[PDB]
Every structure is written in C-alpha cells, then in structure tokens.
Curated annotation (Swiss-Prot), chains A, B, C, D:
Binding site for N-acetyl-beta-D-glucosamine: T81, R102, Y113
Stored SUPFAM superfamilies: Cytolysin/lectin (SSF63724)
Protein name: Agaricus bisporus lectin
Technological use: Lectins can be used to recognize and purifiy specific glycoproteins, and for the purification of cells with specific surface glycoproteins. Has potential as anti-proliferative agent. Sold under the name lectin from Agaricus bisporus by Sigma-Aldrich and under the name of Agaricus bisporus (Mushroom) agglutinin (ABA) by USBiological.
Function as written in the Swiss-Prot or TrEMBL entry: Lectin that recognizes O-linked galactose-beta-1,3-N-acetylgalactosamine, a disaccharide (Thomsen-Friedenreich antigen or T-disaccharide), present on cell surface glycoproteins. Can also bind galactose-beta-1,3-N-acetylglucosamine. Does not bind monosaccharides. Can be internalized by clathrin-coated vesicles after binding to surface glycoproteins. After internalization it inhibits nuclear import of nuclear localization signal dependent proteins. Inhibits proliferation of malignant cells without cytotoxicity for normal cells.
Family: Belongs to the fungal fruit body lectin family.
Taxonomy, superkingdom: Eukaryota
Pfam hit, one: FB_lectin
Oligomeric and partner information: Homotetramer.
Amino acid sequence: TYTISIRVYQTTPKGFFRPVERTNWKYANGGTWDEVRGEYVLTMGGSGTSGSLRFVSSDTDESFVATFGVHNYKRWCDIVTNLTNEQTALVINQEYYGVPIRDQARENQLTSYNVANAKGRRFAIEYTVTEGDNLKANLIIG
Amino acid sequence: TYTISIRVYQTTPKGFFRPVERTNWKYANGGTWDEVRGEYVLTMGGSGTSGSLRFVSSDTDESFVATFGVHNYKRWCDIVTNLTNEQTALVINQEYYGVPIRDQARENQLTSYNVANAKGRRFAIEYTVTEGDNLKANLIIG
Amino acid sequence: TYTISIRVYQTTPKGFFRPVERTNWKYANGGTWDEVRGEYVLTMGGSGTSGSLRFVSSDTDESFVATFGVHNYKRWCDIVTNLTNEQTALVINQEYYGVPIRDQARENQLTSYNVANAKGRRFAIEYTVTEGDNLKANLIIG
Amino acid sequence: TYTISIRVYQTTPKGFFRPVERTNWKYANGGTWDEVRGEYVLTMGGSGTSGSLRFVSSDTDESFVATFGVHNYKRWCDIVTNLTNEQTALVINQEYYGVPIRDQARENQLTSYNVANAKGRRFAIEYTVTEGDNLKANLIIG
C-alpha cells in the first residue's frame, strides 16, 4: 500500500485557490482520497495508478490539475494549467494512460515538477519523501 | 448556473462510510465541488453535465457512487453499488455519457432513487428542491 | 498519547446538524482536533484533559455540545443540549473542571451517555473501543 | 449579524501549520465557525464577541492563535504566538474579556496585525473588507 500525503502552500495573497475536485484512476485496484491532519492523502493498493486534484481561483480566473502516482515502483507527478472548461480532473487524470505527451510525463517519474500559466503564475510539486510506502509532497502555488 | 446542495445522512452505526472521491463531468463548461456549511455543493455552468461522489466503508468492504446532474433542464440522480475495484467515481461518472444502462438512468430525470448492495444495505437520494437553478438533495446511507 | 476518534451518525433527515466549534481544555498540555479520514480526532498528551464539539441544526433551532476526555486513565463523555446562546463549546468544556454537576459527569468515566432535548430528539455517545491509547466513539444524532 | 470570512495563506514550505481548534466567545448571542468554499467563516449574532483559530506545526514545534471579532461595531484582530502548552484557543479567546493586555488589543479595533515567534516566523492578519456586516480577512503564515 502506497500513500502520497500532500501539503498545499499558497505563497501569495494574490488570488485564492480552492479545492474543487479529486479523482482516482482505475488501475491497480483504484485508490482513495482522504483529508488527514490538514493534508490531502492519496492511498493506492500498489504501483501503476494515480489520482488528481483540481484547484480554482475564481477571483483571477485561474486553475490547475495536479496529478500524483506511482509508475514501476517510482513516484511521478505532473501539473496541467491553462485549462479549458472541458478539462476537469476527471478528464486530465485519464490522459496519463493513452495520450503520448501525458504518458511521457508519467514515465519521467519526477520527484519535482513546475509549470506556469499564461498569466505568469507558477505551480510546483515537490516530493519531500521520494522513497518507500509513505511518500510526501508539497504542492506550491506561486 | 446550477447548484445541487447535498446533505449526507449516515443513519446506521454499523460500518462507516467516508468520502473518497468527487468528480466533474466535462460537458456544459464543467463544474466544481465545494464544501459549504457541512454540505457538498456541486456547481455546474449549465444543463447537460453532472458530478459524482464516492463513499467507502473499509470496515465492512462496502462502497457506492452517487451521481447528481441536470439533463435537458431537469435534475437527475443515480446510485451505483456492488462496485468492482476498477469502478472509481472517475469511471462511473463518465459512464453516464456513452454506456446505455447509465444513459437511460440519466434520461429518467429522477427526483429520487434508492438501491441495495449485496449485504442488504440501502442507499438513497431524495431531492428536496426539485425545480429552479438551486436544487437540494438528501443522500441517505442506510 | 491518547486519541479519541469520533464517527458522526445523523440517523434522520429531520433537521441537519453541522459542526460549528471544537475546543481543547488546558490541562495535561492541552490537545488538538484533527479531521482524519472523515472522523474527528481528539489528541491528548496524557490523562486529565478533554475537548468539545458543538453541532447546530439551524433548520430546527437545535444544538448540543459533546465532550470527550480521559480522567484517571479512563475515558469519559458527556452531552449538553437545550443550550442558551451563551453556552458555546468554549464555555461548556471548562465547566467540567469546577462545576459540581459537570465534574460528576467526568468522574463517572462513562463508555456511553445519552440525553434528549426539549424538542424530543435524543443524542448519544458510544465508545466502541473503550481501552488503550486509540479510543473510538460513535456520536449518534437521533 | 456579522460574518468574518478568512482565507488562509501558508506561504513557506518549511514546516506545516494545520488547523487544530476553533472557538466561540459567549457574548452577543455567541457565534459559529463554518467552512465555506475553502474559507473559514465566523458568524456572530451582533457586536461584542469573537472567535479564535489555533494552528500548529508539529514538525517545527510552532503554533499560534488568531482571533477575530467585532468590538463597539468595528472589527478587531490579534495574534498570539510563543504559546505555552496550556494556551489553547479556548484559553486565549477568553482572555480578551478580562486580561488587560488582551482587552487593550481588542479595543484597538485593528484592520491589520502582525507578530513574529522566537524562531523569527511572521504571522499576519489583514482585513480586506473593513466595513459593514460581512467582513473579509487574509490570514498569512510566513
């Protein structure tokens, strides 16, 4: 059993990102999202699946989907921003298992990733514990 | 803009269902899930989309997905239980837009629905406000 | 270190009780409230303190304070209802350390307790795990 | 009726502050805490009362209590850090109605306040809406 426990950091009072969606991919017996001691915890039965979180800032018309998983026993992550209204986390989560560019992001098995939106704001995932059964990550909103 | 505000009633202290997933379908400019005063609020851009909540009772190996939406300007709902390990809310929500047995349920535009799992536990949705932009429902776990 | 993990059951769709307050008494180095996997978790460094939760049903003008703690290495609980507007959880929690009738409730070290309000609705605390470091309780709203 | 809607910004991925306590003072018919769209909402019956939030970073042995209220029809705020183990939000909130050094802070009716703990970490409250029934504030953790 894997857990990925995520701490969210909003670094500037410019805009306000709120959680709006949390999804689980169907592989490796699925998985769950729990809130535990102020953290978002993704639990998976083993390697080969993932889950996504979407955050929205209605004040500034900004949003992103952050995806976390394990591929061949190594943690991975990605962030997608500049979302269309059709790009919910339900949509994005699935793309990592069929869309070549997204497949590659998962295959990269990154301990850290960052991307900025068209408005200039950067988002980052940083795994602080990168090995073992209880992985930990910071989700940093710039 | 539509909202569906959901109050969850867990009625029986045998097992414990916890929220594990909340999804948004991509049609009608998508949507969001918010927690508001102890309720789950699904907000949608217009008619033709939906969102799902999955609950799991790990103590008793039980689970269900409850889906809420608006089809042709009328509210709808459905519950799926006796889930396989592959049937996350991400999977189930999407099935309402392509899978015949799910399409028909959506097209029924029900104000109430109930189902029992193999263990005999009843799950129910009852809309308490069935008209207008701001709909309300009870989700009752038996 | 003690934890008391509380599962809330709302047994009837009549009214809707929502969480509005959570307090920690100052003895035995205080304590904390956490949300963990859908449960309310009170953590205390040792015996001799407590914490309170207040729930309100605005629909029906009902409310109660539920208090949980450990006294001389035995768990205790109490519920106060028919609250005046001045009886917040901050107020009620403290009364178990100075008010004779409340002191007695704590000294009783109950594994279960129930009380009904003037409107006829009953509330109950039921400890399902009554011994050890990780205590568990059902909070049942009738 | 007053509301104070609070957005929490945790700006630095060194340590992690989690919400552990939320209290309501007894004056002006008390009040409630609600979670609304990712924000903390303190609702009060009238002028002359307050509510407190405690946050703890267990990883770095840091904590603070942030208090928000209305005094003589003007909003006020304060932060207390470098807390002893006995100083829960239950304790701190009550001190604003009897303890001279706390009374004076409330009477200042501040729209903004900041303080640093012994480790040099800054905590700040800034009201973004300073007039009317529905007030807004940022709680910024440095």
